[PDB]
Ligand binder design. Structure first.
Ligand SMILES: Nc1ncnc2c1ncn2[C@@H]1O[C@H](COP(=O)(O)OP(=O)(O)OP(=O)(O)OP(=O)(O)OC[C@H]2O[C@@H](n3cnc4c(N)ncnc43)[C@H](O)[C@@H]2O)[C@@H](O)[C@H]1O
Lengths: 111, 115
């Protein structure tokens, strides 16, 4: 279990943007841009490297939900979606998460 | 034309060369021409979608397929210490090629914030 499991279970608070039967979107507690939120599956997939073929449409659902949340939050000028894997990827929580950052110019390289 | 007529559509149809990692009926993975990490590749749909903000609901499986292929290619390329997947959207996201692309970067420590 991780802190994101606690958030899904409503045991600790987060600023929830969207929820359905299979995912949750909420603002990141350590924002790196004026808008910075996460979309996470309710299924506990620890990291993208272990996602199974059967998870394909769920992973795409995270991206469609992230797209819709970004539009609802006014990110008309663009944004960046990020999935971190493992140590080199800087993955901070072992529950897969799609980060969405916008409201400023994002730079290159992306870390 | 299948794939559209950006540079990425030209790569899909073999009109412009690329260093291809994986190809199926839905997507293509190839190495980036301007790598920002020791390994840096792209996964693109063969269906032309200009940018993620106009993807349709019925594109869900295709987008998830880009991520599955990205993680499978990262494993085949030996990125066992990890990697970062990046989808740039529009001006603030840093997008110039208006054909959806998922970038995978690894082979070094990635930093925070991600740009
Ligand atoms: N054949 C290939 N094979 C493998 N990988 C490839 C590839 N081609 C691209 N890639 C890679 O695909 C990934 C995603 O590509 P992108 O990040 O979308 O675009 P890019 O190819 O990196 O364009 P770049 O930043 O260099 O061009 P710019 O807009 O400054 O400027 C481009 C032109 O647009 C003009 N322009 C840009 N912004 C403008 C503006 N606001 N107004 C007027 N003109 C503008 C500029 O003057 C300039 O002439 C990248 O990592 C890239 O390396």
């Amino acid at each position: 279990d991780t802190i994101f499991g606690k958030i899904i279970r409503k045991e600790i608070p987060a600023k929830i943007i969207f929820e359905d039967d299979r995912c949750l979107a909420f603002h990141d507690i350590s924002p790196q841009a004026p808008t910075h939120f996460l979309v996470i599956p309710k299924k506990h997939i620890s990291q993208i490297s272990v996602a199974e073929d059967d998870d394909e449409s769920l992973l795409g659902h995270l991206m469609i939900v992230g797209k819709k949340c970004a539009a609802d939050l006014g990110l008309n000028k663009g944004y960046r979606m990020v999935v971190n894997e493992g140590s080199d990827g800087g993955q901070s929580v072992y529950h897969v998460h799609l980060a969405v950052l916008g409201g400023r110019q994002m730079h290159w390289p992306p870390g």
